[PDB]
């Protein structure tokens, strides 16, 4: 087990500049000093410098805590020196004060060391320690059970922090909600047929509602666990670069240099778009010439190099253009990696739904140059071998392929040591991966789950071993990522509106294409499109109507001409007066 | 000027009960006595019996502001027992919390006489007295000016209360933003022809951006008074009716009940758009034969009854209804008459231009009944005799016609007897009717001024004697209303929006079909939808950085293994050795 340390700092050291990083050192053990944690030093191989450091003394720890408390209350997060023991402590909230206190600045009660800006820029990890025991606990509980009760997702919460456990939340939430399209296109082509419009309709309903019930439990969950309204606290990039200094002094960017370097991506979208359209344009042309006389499986299997080498390139964008603060960058990153996935993963299908099926003729030249009708049931079976085969390759990437990266790779305190130095090795755990791969299966069953109706079915299965399987990438394949504090999922909630809106406008154009004039067509469209917005307007309005969270806060606020007439008997007996009078 | 009074009740005594009604009269001169209000009593017409209340001890009144204060603390309507001097006190508060202590419970620091539930059933009225020297001066100083500025508005403000303040900045914006839909007509007029495509996509275009202004005008104007949030405030209906009483006690009303009541309101809408459709084609049918060989505008001049009457039995069925809040009894009974006016007040022009235009040949037996082509630019010019004729009624019926119904009607200190008693013969005021008036106005504008494009242009002239009107009618022809607060202008946004949809979804439809297949016409209006609501979002993503009141709160936020190394020098001594033996 862990001998009591609380975070772990690597400081490698090169030989090239052995004087100057010594200097570094000697800085950065003072700068761990003031603060008031005690710090070990200890080998690591690659020539590094493996330092220790826990905090000592519980007064400190405990005017950090208070200090901390003082600050969420002010800001409208909490609206409730031995409050420790009034209100449980727990490890993923310690851990994120030790690390604010490791990286805070000094005129915030912390000792700033952050690895990136200053002198200290040999420093390049500072990562917690793994649990062996309660990791094997949680692996062999959570394969052994059918469902996951909140009780997990609260021990998620308490030892790896929040953003982890708000996505396995809506991990558990989203599975347990794909249970009714499975159903609902069993039905559907047990006996319905092939493109009906009644699945699209219920498709629609169904993505309306597990939104909607999703926003609410979100809003539960925000409540319950106190972390309601974190995302209005902003907190400043340490990376951030400024020209001009004003007036407390904030330092200001020039918003022209910003809109420059921003307008730079509209190339690079064409650029991308341009590209895979001709890539996936030269791929039919090719499959089409071997049926005249495989290719979408090698594409299927060809794109994740080419998304990675985009998703760099996007990435390098993003920290070319200077960002403020952490929330902002984050949006922007997401909103990059969204359409880049969007694009790679989609304009396949839409070329064979909206480009081969309504008019087949404009790809002619290709078909010449490689040396006719269309099919209409051909997208179906294509969405197949586009489903399927991903299912397989998404689990081989992602489990398998890095096991045996490792493997490879591998092959008196010494066992904690080895253990550590093993451990540092491993890269930071990114919980973006997993939301946009979510949000790319769900936009798949809201757009075009009508051609073949079974494959949510599929997707239902995938589900239940991702809920186990990202597990074991934290346990093993990745190092404790730092526990922060978040609001809600963030942006990813307008990327599932849009998918929503363009699924209600894609699947009954979809069926309408493929089960045969535009008047009909744009009628359908029309149709469909109304009737999502209605049955949204209207599952609003019933969710407005059902939540402890507003019970709690209300019970909390609840807990905490003058002259003639002086006297009275006067005025009555002159009012006795005037109804007697009154009758004359 | 007034005697200092500061309210006064009417409490007419019928001869039929005079014992009975006795009676309530002592115990209503108890019922003032506890509270601390002087109570005199004066004769009053048509067998009646005035009595005058104002507070006297300063004690108790600034007792009831520290408690009223307090109270609106609690619950976040204000963020900031000599307070008094502190912050000034109004005549709009001063009146509402003296209402407050006449009409509230007992248990609540109050003595209820509410005329409608408790045994004193003969008081029918209580209302506060003008002003006149003001009233002069306010019709003086409104009717010499180009503009009113925000000083005026904040005058009333302090004077008639909050609603009244909001109906005029309402009003106000509203006349100062439909400059830009006069020009665009006036231009479109002038040389571009008629039915403009270019003319609809800005009038969408200007309703988004009005909408969206006045959505942050009236958070700012909330913000700024200190009312921000009364709307989260709920206020018990005196009238609401009980069965059961549960558990702090509050009644409840079995709900079946309410829903079985409101089911009565589908047969009712039925009911009345069968008729009214009836009686719109009767008079087109008659229109039509008699110019085969006015009577719209017999309709329009006839329309009023049937409109009071549908009103009557829209408020008896409100009331039938039971309520247990005033905002939700409010709130039914303003989409009530929203519904209803809508109906009498567009489908005359929807039947013009959605029945008669597109195809002619369906009323054939109405004409061969009353023994042929149909003329694509017969709306334009009815629609102008709908709007001018119109502009001429409504400034008949509510301006000239209750001050000649006035003027028959009437045709030491008895003169300031004789003004109460004139005084309080009058209605009560009433800023529903004038916001329905500006709302159908918006409607007017927004769905039906393409084929007039002049038409806004002399709403615009109407608007400003509208702003200095309606004053005139709170001068003269109406009672004091009691001061209330109210966060926004209500439900009326809802509409305003309704209104602004269905304006993009018609103005584009009735462009194509004027100008002149189906696909034609269901891609005008798809494409018009699609660019309204792209111009919404963008128009909220700008307004969304733009506000002094959150800078305001800001501001106000803001201002409120171990023992081996225990030693430092040894930890550095120790890091050098290895930085040193890491060389070999
Ligand atoms: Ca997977
Ligand atoms: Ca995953
Ligand atoms: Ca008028
Ligand atoms: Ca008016």
Same mark, same amino acid.
């Given at each position: 087990?862990?001998?009591?340390?609380?975070?772990?700092? &690597?400081?490698?050291?090169?030989?090239?500049?052995?004087?100057?990083?010594? *200097?570094?050192?000697?800085?950065?053990?003072? /700068?761990?000093?003031?603060?008031? =944690?005690?710090?070990?030093?200890?080998?690591?191989?690659?020539?590094?410098?493996?330092?220790?450091?826990?905090?000592?003394?519980?007064?400190?720890?405990?005017?950090?805590?208070?200090?901390?408390?003082?600050?969420?209350?002010?800001?409208?997060?909490?609206? !409730?020196?031995?409050?420790?023991?009034?209100?449980?402590?727990?490890?993923?909230?310690?851990?994120?004060?030790?690390?604010?206190?490791?990286?805070?600045?000094?005129?915030?009660?912390?000792?700033?060391?952050?690895?990136?800006? /200053?002198?200290?820029?040999?420093?390049? +990890?500072?990562?917690?320690?793994? !649990?062996?025991?309660?990791? #094997?606990?949680?692996? #062999?509980?959570?394969?052994?059970?059918?469902?996951?009760?909140?009780?997990?997702?609260?021990?998620?919460?308490? #030892?790896?922090?929040?953003?982890?456990?708000?996505?396995?939340?809506?991990?558990?939430?989203?599975?347990?909600?794909?249970?009714?399209?499975? *159903?609902?296109?069993?039905?559907?082509?047990?006996?319905?047929?092939?493109?009906?419009?009644?699945?699209?309709?219920?498709?629609?309903?169904?993505? $309306? $509602?597990?939104?909607?019930?999703?926003?609410?439990?979100?809003?539960?969950? *925000?409540?319950?666990?106190?972390?309601?309204?974190?995302? !209005?606290?902003?907190?400043?990039?340490?990376?951030?670069?400024?020209? &001009?200094?004003?007036?407390?002094?904030? #330092?200001?960017?020039?918003?022209?240099?910003?809109?420059?370097?921003?307008?730079?991506?509209?190339?690079?979208?064409?650029?991308?778009?341009?590209?895979?359209?001709?890539?996936?344009?030269?791929?039919?042309? =090719?499959?089409?010439?071997?049926?005249?006389?495989?290719?979408?499986?090698?594409?299927?299997?060809?794109?994740?190099?080419? !998304?990675?080498?985009?998703?760099?390139?996007?990435?390098?964008?993003?920290?070319?253009?200077?960002?403020?603060?952490?929330?902002?960058?984050?949006?922007?990153?997401?909103?990059?990696?969204?359409?880049?996935?969007?694009?790679?993963?989609?304009?396949?299908?839409?070329?064979?739904?909206?480009?081969?099926?309504?008019?087949?003729?404009?790809? &002619?030249?290709?078909?010449?140059?490689?040396?006719?009708?269309?099919?209409?049931?051909?997208?179906?079976?294509?969405?197949?071998? @586009?489903?399927?085969?991903?299912?397989?390759?998404?689990?081989?990437?992602?489990?398998?392929?890095?096991?045996?990266?490792?493997?490879?790779?591998?092959?008196?305190?010494?066992?904690?040591?080895?253990?550590?130095?093993?451990?540092?090795?491993?890269?930071?755990?990114?919980?973006?991966?997993?939301?946009?791969?979510?949000?790319?299966?769900?936009?798949?069953?809201?757009?075009?789950?009508?051609?073949?109706?079974?494959?949510?079915?599929?997707?239902?299965?995938?589900?239940?071993?991702?809920?186990?399987?990202? *597990?074991?990438?934290?346990?093993?394949?990745?190092?404790?990522?730092?526990?922060?504090?978040?609001?809600?999922?963030?942006?990813?909630?307008?990327?599932?509106?849009?998918?929503?809106?363009?699924?209600?406008?894609?699947? +009954?154009?979809?069926?309408?294409?493929?089960?045969?004039?535009?008047?009909?067509?744009?009628?359908?469209? =029309? @149709?469909?499109? &109304?009737?999502?917005?209605?049955?949204? =307007?209207?599952?609003?309005?019933?969710? +407005?109507?059902?939540?402890?969270?507003?019970?709690?806060?209300?019970?909390?606020? @609840?807990?905490?001409?003058?002259?003639?007439?002086?006297?009275?008997?006067?005025?009555?007996?002159?009012?006795?007066?005037?109804?007697?009078?009154?009758?004359?």
């Amino acid at each position: 087990s862990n001998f009591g340390v609380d975070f772990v700092i &690597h400081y490698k050291v090169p030989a090239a500049e052995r004087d100057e990083a010594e *200097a570094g050192f000697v800085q950065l053990i003072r /700068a761990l000093t003031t603060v008031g =944690l005690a710090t070990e030093v200890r080998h690591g191989e690659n020539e590094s410098l493996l330092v220790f450091v826990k905090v000592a003394s519980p007064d400190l720890f405990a005017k950090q805590v208070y200090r901390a408390r003082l600050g969420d209350w002010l800001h409208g997060v909490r609206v !409730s020196a031995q409050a420790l023991q009034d209100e449980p402590v727990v490890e993923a909230e310690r851990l994120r004060l030790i690390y604010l206190m490791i990286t805070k600045p000094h005129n915030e009660g912390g000792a700033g060391v952050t690895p990136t800006n /200053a002198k200290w820029k040999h420093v390049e +990890s500072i990562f917690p320690l793994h !649990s062996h025991s309660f990791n #094997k606990e949680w692996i #062999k509980k959570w394969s052994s059970k059918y469902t996951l009760e909140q009780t997990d997702i609260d021990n998620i919460r308490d #030892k790896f922090g929040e953003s982890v456990a708000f996505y396995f939340a809506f991990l558990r939430s989203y599975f347990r909600f794909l249970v009714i399209p499975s *159903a609902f296109g069993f039905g559907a082509w047990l006996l319905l047929g092939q493109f009906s419009y009644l699945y699209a309709l219920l498709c629609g309903l169904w993505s $309306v $509602v597990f939104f909607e019930y999703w926003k609410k439990q979100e809003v539960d969950l *925000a409540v319950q666990w106190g972390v309601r309204g974190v995302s !209005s606290i902003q907190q400043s990039r340490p990376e951030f670069e400024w020209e &001009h200094e004003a007036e407390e002094p904030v #330092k200001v960017y020039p918003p022209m240099k910003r809109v420059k370097t921003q307008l730079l991506q509209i190339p690079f979208a064409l650029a991308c778009v341009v590209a895979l359209g001709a890539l996936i344009v030269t791929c039919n042309s =090719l499959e089409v010439f071997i049926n005249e006389v495989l290719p979408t499986i090698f594409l299927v299997i060809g794109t994740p190099t080419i !998304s990675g080498v985009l998703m760099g390139a996007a990435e390098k964008l993003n920290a070319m253009e200077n960002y403020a603060t952490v929330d902002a960058h984050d949006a922007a990153l997401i909103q990059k990696q969204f359409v880049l996935n969007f694009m790679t993963s989609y304009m396949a299908l839409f070329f064979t739904a909206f480009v081969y099926i309504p008019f087949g003729h404009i790809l &002619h030249p290709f078909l010449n140059f490689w040396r006719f009708q269309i099919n209409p049931a051909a997208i179906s079976n294509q969405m197949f071998y @586009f489903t399927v085969t991903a299912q397989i390759v998404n689990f081989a990437t992602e489990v398998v392929v890095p096991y045996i990266k490792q493997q490879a790779f591998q092959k008196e305190e010494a066992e904690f040591l080895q253990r550590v130095r093993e451990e540092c090795t491993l890269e930071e755990y990114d919980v973006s991966g997993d939301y946009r791969e979510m949000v790319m299966q769900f936009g798949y069953v809201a757009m075009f789950s009508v051609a073949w109706p079974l494959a949510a079915c599929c997707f239902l299965v995938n589900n239940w071993v991702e809920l186990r399987s990202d *597990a074991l990438k934290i346990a093993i394949s990745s190092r404790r990522p730092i526990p922060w504090r978040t609001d809600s999922i963030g942006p990813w909630l307008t990327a599932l509106s849009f998918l929503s809106w363009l699924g209600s406008i894609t699947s +009954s154009a979809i069926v309408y294409l493929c089960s045969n004039k535009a008047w009909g067509l744009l009628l359908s469209i =029309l @149709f469909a499109e &109304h009737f999502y917005l209605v049955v949204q =307007l209207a599952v609003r309005f019933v969710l +407005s109507k059902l939540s402890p969270g507003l019970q709690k806060e209300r019970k909390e606020r @609840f807990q905490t001409f003058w002259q003639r007439q002086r006297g009275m008997q006067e005025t009555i007996e002159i009012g006795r007066r005037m109804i007697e009078q009154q009758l004359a």
